């Protein structure tokens, strides 16, 4: 078989139909495929699959820790479910619908019970493919929910049950974040079925997957059930309008008979619908079409190959990969912070990159060139004393390790984190002397190898080496009375050590120091010049550059267009000219023997001959370094997992030499504690790295090309697999996630401490403490873990931010020049959909807190005996008192208690200082009871139980738990309240117990009941309906169906898309469902003649 | 319907057209497998660095060592690993014992917490220590 | 502090065994005052915010603070003696550049 679209060869028509799907051609099957590449000059396709698959058979790997962005849901886009609380059964006059002979039962859309309530249960009716596994599941209030408010810092509590009031805000923020995370899904389009039930004739109902979908019809579409009987539910149904049900609108575009998208009326909550709409918008903004992929890869290839990705016209081909430069910069900053001066972290990257260069370059290292050029044996020479033999001994040409050279090349890409130097061992032993033939070769090797290092202080070391070797023969003045000429060369490591006798040539006397003057002039004049080079595809891939323009790559060496026919002895090339200058200098040093007394024989001839052979050695390394190597670096750099991070090279200018690199977490308008990052503690700009000069010199002198090299063919072969195994796109997605997570972290953590970050606050009424560094650190840890599990991450994400004081405001990175000028780069932070959705959830929670099991306000403890059935949640006004009520007593932290003697009533201290007895109406902050729970509990219980003492406890917000009871019997609540008061703990508080009378649909008698705890404001928003199956409620709390929730059904004039956020959520509204295609990355690599 | 398992634990007519014959007479240069093996190593993301950060309980992770000592030890580990990859007894490229006097270098370790205090006693231990010094019990 | 006794102050941790007991001696103001006894009267008249850590100098992120200032039980005499003692060492201090 054959696929003409991509010229691939297959074997199965089924596999042919599967493969044409990646070409946009539907079936007219290995979704594991991530990328599919194929060459044009050979038969060798390459595919990539996820690293977690258990069958790597003839496939490459994708080791990037990519997140899971696209996930689908076929269930109901709802998170609130109605649950019965007190079951009830009542007789009915109509039992079942009747057709010709068969009959069908009646299925109500709502529970048929005495009372029912709304409970939060994320994805309780969903049907997902991949699970975010961050569900928030509440329990009905008749049960205990205390454990959902103590997952956070409540570690060393004094009670297993109960929560710490100082961390409700932290726990609630974490809960809201999980609520947002668990709903990040795409509404999948599914099948339908035309209905002909008389109440909903002609509707197009949506059908859930799995067996027996129609069991869900009663839940989805309330109007489907008729109006058989007289009851709350039947009246509610009679209120609704018929037409708004089932399918509402559909796309014009369709494949086969399946519409592309559809709009449907179905049961759902507005909150999650809005959240998923925002998620859809965010993903849609990242779409990419394959043509710009062609552009990006072609430009990225530096014009050595051309890429083509044919495709068919479509609009639902979603390939989310486009992000902004700011997110890439933020992610790069995070990656840099991850290092933390850990050499073990950085070493593998450099080693692997060096190996990759070694295995892709046409250059070959061959010391036999050196050996043949020297052509010296000198057998049986006990005292050789010959320059050729000594230089061969130093070079040690036969040995082949050359990791130093490739690592030196690789270091250029990471100038900003690691600095390459020459190990101090390579320097002459004990400084050395010009009188030694041994030390001359060390100087030669070191001088010839220095320029390739990234050390900014290399030229000073090069000069100071010869200055050290010349002590006693040739003297120069020292500016500093401390530092002498004999100061070791390898110590001049920082710009502040540069001698003025070197900066200003004129201070070197040509009479007192001819050779030093010449050497200084040579260094000034012929030291290599840095340059620049373009790379990458900024218009599509963005750029992670920070201190450089986005599309440029810095080099310490000038570069030229590639041309193989270049002459070897082209002195225009900077490296060759440098070698020639060094050789000529050593020559001029050695002719007259002014500096080598104690040589018995005139070694001038042999010395000069060896220097000439080295000067004119016809190696091809400088050619490669000037032409080919920059091209290879440009090709590789965009593909790397760690994008390049450079700091500008200045050849000899001193005052602009960089010396320090730091990271900042605070904004520019805050005066805070100076907390420098660890990276600033390095003596050099980056982590020191030592190289071997000998290997670099051997590489520079023993380079050659294959005798049949053709650049086009070689580089096409090199690029094809490297790009076939690319991982850029996963990196882009991860970077977007990282920026999102950082913004979410700052936004949340700003709401539990004092940070001058300008952000609206809506959970201030929730009590909490003032978070310190450790508390914020633990909270940030929980946030980080939640996010990592949400998107199925396993590698680093926000870990470097947790080192110290996570009370941050904004990322920023900067570096410093020697002359004090600093460059500060602050990425332009874009929006964050997750943080905005969390804020919206906070808005809603500020009105719908009862659905989450939180009660707002205060409570009043006091005996009340009566037969009325007013619910505790909504007490009559004439039972409560506030701070602004005549005759009340307010209390502060000073609340000393004095026993009265000889029958005098015991007394307690008012806030104003007056002394009052145990009766009346009081106000306590809850902390006061927490301070002395045992003492107050011992002192007050009798008066509260039998006397006339009532206390209002200032709480702000608190969890609550209900205890339904039959009003027809006697009922005393003293036991529950006493138990609650006993378990008050300096670090914990149990949920507040409330007693509520069960509503009745028929006349009943009443019996006395005794309460002790009532709320201070309305808290029954969670109540849905009472006695739903009966015509009306006779006694007890009464509540009809909350019509305003079903606005689009009950309000005839409401437009279909209207919502009532953020004060009321709707339980029935319009939902859009899609069905997209996510084809793999397809490419065809073509060669360039 | 389809489902995808997670990789991390969670909360819980003739047809032979005349151009399809194969003459695999071309050998790539450089070889495909050779380049693939090299780029496989470069694919791998950099290792995580959890040390010095708090855990689920609130106690920081790491070992109780001086920061400078930790940085030096990490440098030695890097040099040893570098020697290991090059199949040599002594690494030609060393991250330790260089010319530079990097005596002020610091590395993140588990010795110090976020408050700047010492981790001689874990965070949770100190919190329990403090909070239990204030509790009161039932009267005699 | 995880308890409402103080306004989330920072409490210094002593080393060695049986360390909680020190928490009730270091900070007198942390005790609750339910009684009318002499000690509770004395505590009730004191300022609240002057307890625990007062100020610190955190220079490098991820390292120990250079020094801290704290309220705790002590005596002025030994505080002064250790004060002038430290000054003598500070006068003798030198740094690696001079070395």
Q: How much of the residues of chain A is beta strand, in percent? A: 15-25%
Structural class of the secondary elements of chain B?
A: mainly alpha
Sheet-strand content of chain B, in percent, reads under 5%
SSE run of chain B: HHH
Specify which chain pair forms the largest interface.
A-B, 114 and 87 residues
Q: How many β-strand stretches of chain A? A: 40
Task: Tell me about the largest β-sheet of chain A.
Answer: 7 strands, mixed
What Rg of chain A, in angstroms, do the CA atoms define? Answer: 40 Å
Quick one: biggest sheet of chain B?
A: none
Number of DSSP helices of chain B? Answer: 3
- State the oligomer: part of a larger assembly
Number of helices of chain A: 28
Number of strands of chain B: 0
- Straight-line distance between termini of chain B: 66 Å
PDB class: viral protein/transferase/rna
Keywords: asymmetric, mu2, lambda3, lambda1, virus, VIRAL PROTEIN-TRANSFERASE-RNA complex
Entry title: In situ structure of transcriptional enzyme complex and capsid shell protein of mammalian reovirus at initiation state
Chains A, C: Lambda 1
Describe it.
The structure is cut from a larger assembly and holds two copies of chain A and one copy of chain B (140 residues). In chain A, strands 28, 29, 33, 34, 35, 36 and 37 form a seven-stranded mixed beta sheet that branches. The two termini of chain A are 29 Å apart. Chain A is α+β, with helices and mostly antiparallel strands and 1089 residues long. Chain A is built from 28 helices and 40 strands. In chain A, helix 2 crosses helix 24 and helix 12 runs antiparallel to helix 13. Chain A is elongated, with a radius of gyration of 40 Å. The longest helix of chain A has 22 residues. Chain B is an all-alpha fold. Helix content of chain B is 29%, strand content 0%. Chain B is built from three helices and no strands. The longest helix of chain B is centred in the middle third of the chain and has 19 residues. The chains are: A alpha+beta (1089), B mainly alpha (140). It is classed as viral protein/transferase/rna. The entry lists the keywords asymmetric, mu2, lambda3, lambda1, virus, VIRAL PROTEIN-TRANSFERASE-RNA complex. In situ structure of transcriptional enzyme complex and capsid shell protein of mammalian reovirus at initiation state. Chains A, C: Lambda 1. Organism of A, C: Mammalian orthoreovirus 3.
